[PDB]
Amino acid sequence: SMQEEDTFRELRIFLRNVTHRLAIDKRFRVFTKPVDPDEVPDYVTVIKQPMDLSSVISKIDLHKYLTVKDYLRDIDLICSNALEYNPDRDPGDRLIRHRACALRDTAYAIIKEELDEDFEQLCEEIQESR
Secondary structure, three states: OHHHHHHHHHHHHHHHHHHHHHHOOHHHHHHOOOOOOOOOOOHHHHOOOOOOHHHHHHHHHOOOOOOHHHHHHHHHHHHHHHHHHOOOOOHHHHHHHHHHHHHHHHHHHHHHHHOOHHHHHHHHHHHHOO
């Protein structure tokens, strides 16, 4: 129905806004674009599902997210990829992991405060009906 398509449009608006706010945060610069093959050639061999905030924006616009839970799976993937690829004790790896955790925690915190649970449940129920 048109009411359902309006629901998903509002969802995309909400997701674009959250993603923007993450993408403009200086801490999260490393997560705004794909890892560059030239600089890190073993990346695509170790990490089987690369993800980044630019790809998330593209996915929003392609209607790939019909719930906030589906969006959060890709925010979680950005974070888990960073933890997996950079697991060592040195300061460069520890910094990226701290930033990855902050990206995840920040996204969840924005969503906890600004997503209406009945809106999410509506999206879930429409998604399940398809």
